[PDB]
User: Fold this.
Amino acid sequence: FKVPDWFLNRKKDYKDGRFSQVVSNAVDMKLRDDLERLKKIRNHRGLRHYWGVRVRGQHTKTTGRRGKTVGVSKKR
Amino acid sequence: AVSYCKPGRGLIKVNGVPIELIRPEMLRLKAFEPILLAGRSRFKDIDMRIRVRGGGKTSQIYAIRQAIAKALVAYYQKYVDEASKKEVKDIFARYDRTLLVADPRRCEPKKFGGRGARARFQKSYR
Amino acid sequence: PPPSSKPAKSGGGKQKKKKWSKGKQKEKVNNSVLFDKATYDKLLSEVPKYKQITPSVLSERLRINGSLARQAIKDLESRGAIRVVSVHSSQLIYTRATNA
Amino acid sequence: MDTQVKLAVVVKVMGRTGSRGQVTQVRVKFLDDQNRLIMRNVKGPVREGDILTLLESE
Amino acid sequence: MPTKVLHITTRKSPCGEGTNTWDRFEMRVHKRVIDLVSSADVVKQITSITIEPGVEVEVTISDQ
Amino acid sequence: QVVKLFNCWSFEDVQVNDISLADYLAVSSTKHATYLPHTAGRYSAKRFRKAQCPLVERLTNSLMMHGRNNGKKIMAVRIVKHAMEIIHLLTDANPIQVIVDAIINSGPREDATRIGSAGAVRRQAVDISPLRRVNQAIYLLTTGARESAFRNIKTIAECLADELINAAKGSSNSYAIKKKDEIERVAKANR
Amino acid sequence: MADSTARTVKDVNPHEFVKAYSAHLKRSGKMELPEWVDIVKTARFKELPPYDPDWYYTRAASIARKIYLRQGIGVGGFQKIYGGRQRNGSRPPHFCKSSGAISRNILQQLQKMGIIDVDPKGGRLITSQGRRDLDQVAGRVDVTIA
RNA sequence: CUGGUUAAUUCCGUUAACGAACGAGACCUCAGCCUGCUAACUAGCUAUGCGGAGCCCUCCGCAGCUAGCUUCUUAGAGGGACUAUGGCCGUUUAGGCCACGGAAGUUGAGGCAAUAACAGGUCUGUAUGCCCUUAAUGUUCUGGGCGCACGCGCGCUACACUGAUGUAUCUUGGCCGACAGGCCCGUUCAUCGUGAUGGGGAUAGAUCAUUGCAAUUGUUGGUCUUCAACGAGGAAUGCCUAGUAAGCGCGAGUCAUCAGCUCGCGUUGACUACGUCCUGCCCUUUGUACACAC
RNA sequence: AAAAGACUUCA
Assistant:
């Protein structure tokens, strides 16, 4: 086994580097680089993090208490 | 020669017995009985009449049952051997009679009527 | 007999966590302390005279020794001939010292 | 103490709840070892001539 | 010789809506009957065809 | 002779000491007993002795269910069967006899139904007609074994053996005996 | 000595059969894996480190009891039999099998040896030779059971 | 009206009634409809061969519409089971229980359920009276939308030994592959140590294929990695009388795609059944100031 | 021999 990014060095920020394995603190650390990422890039993903809403799609219908706070009394 | 077949039925799955009398070996799908149903209590339900009777070597039972689960297989297998004996011997009528025979049952799964979550336990609301 | 509190917008109540937790075993199985004599003689050997035969699990529980941990102990004794096991599927079975 | 005999016949519906059909006590005598009358408590109606163990009682 | 059975059983809560119980099995059999001759003469074919009794019976002369 | 019942244990040696309870504890069927599993509809006629029984059928049958989720009678038959051999190796006595000791000890003499009448709710204590005794008892023995298995590294076949031996010995460690004499204590008092 | 054997190739609870057989299978010349296995072959746990007693053999053995009775039986007939591939609850799976790669590899080695042939549509059928090791072994086993 | 009986103005016995309809039952349905058979073979059994196997003795496979019959398959008839036979006190018809036997008077599940009313609901499962109107609330497309501080609902999955995992117990042949494809022809037992983990799979990122022009708020499967909440659930509620609850999977429709939907099937298989002792309901009774109606 | 109250207007 191995793993190396490659392609022509062209692409700026973010890529994949070739499945970081690796794993663990480098992956949690890059997972932040990846959160941070989308946000400056201005993609629909990043834009969601700034908002705090869950990014890869739930039912929504209920459930998502975690996603941006506890049950918050009634509403308005 | 010797081969007497009286065909019971009671649950899905079909047992044809042609029985030539000798040493007490038991076949199913033409393969040895304890080993095909290895690890079962319901297998020894069958075994009940080829011990208890005081006849051991008098029945080599050749059995084929085809199509449904492990559980079902015993109840049918048994009936046939008893019924055949009763026809010849009127003194071993009390072999057929006192050792249990005859249930279709008729309670193998029932209709599914609409609304049911299973079929008959209607929804939790409405 | 009661459960616990009750939830909060969130939320749930729970109440309960346990005794603990030592007899981590397999680590203490290698090093000499539980492996050399004591576990075998005390737990295994001492228990047997009171009852000639006992299930492995029961032994497991009273002795407060891991099922794996005295599986190994049992096996060593078995080789010695001090004990004789029988069998069963669930890894359960019966443990005997001597027949007599 | 208070004995414990084989069977018992219901002497009469000692009164009770009712209106139509009787949860609540009954007076029974013990069928053998006669002449101890006590009121044992049961669920459900009865009828006199019903025979019941009131098992241990005590 | 009349062999095996074809069911389409379709049950609709017909509508209201809302209708969601006391729904419906109207259940439909269509039945298949396959009759050979041992020898298919010229003579068989012709007598059988001319006077052919189907009212609702749909019967197909067939074929290698 | 060649006794069956898992092919290791007899059942016509098994004594039921309580005469009233004995006459509802079938250890013998039309030709003699067995334990091999089935079902057989005889319903629920009243007053009299009114059904045929098997304890062994009820007990495995309590196990598959109570408690809880997921298991099957084939698993349940297996656990009863494992529990029975564990019982015999810890008592050196027929495990069918030990379940009879457990059921008689765990089967309360009187019980305590809750009746609203007039402006209030009384419990005046009631009968427990002997199939209900047998059952409360088995259930409590099974629920105990289930409860013990949930919270200990002890197989439940062992836990059933553990609960059953404690009940079949009058030991207030058992859930089943402890609930039995709880029920008799309230039923005796609430007069 | 025959009597237990013969039969028993057929009727015996696998588990001693497969075990019993795998040791006899070891002797053979073959077992070339050409590194295909390593990528992630089976269920979870299941990459082939364990396999030298536990997958390879018991799998080779596996086909072999199946083929006698079942035949004719093909690569799909193999792939499936252990497997799940259940429609999920969507909170699970379950595991995932493959198993076109798997089935293929076990069938090739056997053919070189002379054990299996292929019909042009009914899949491959037992030779005289394939019966001859399977049954002469089913011989040791029935004794150990009884 | 009554007397009795029953799921049943069901039937009987009375009666100012004598009828009569319509529901129910009967009926066609399916579950065991079986059973010995009449009917044919899919297929099963059985025969005979032949490739072999253990060492025609035993066993597997296929061979010929080759031989016949049969539980399978299949349609019919009958078998029905009906108080015809025998029981028990009892105005009287009865109810209650018990036996032969495949199974008894409501054999079972409800599919076959009355009319009328409900300004119920559907104008979009399917027309449409009328009005916004009238070369527009047509067109024929391109794009976007079914977000969730939060509450109700159905439902699905877990909390752990009724366990976990591993091994073992429109499709295909077979060569190449890790899922995902693309073609040439055509319960056993290693493990589990009762551990918020080897539980749990939530979530988020990387990324490959396929359905489709497209997979990003809106495909699925997934290499792999994050490893969430949850320690069996309150105030409370549903449904259930034994092949039923419950639990396991699959098929069918839905359908370019689809979690799981609705629906059925088979398999595993429990407990409780005595009663009306909050709710719906029946007829009779009495009161009634009410009359789309407590 | 009954724990317990309400329930907009016209049709």
User: Anything to note?
Assistant: Residues 118-119 of chain F lie near RNA strand I (CB under 10 Å from a C1').
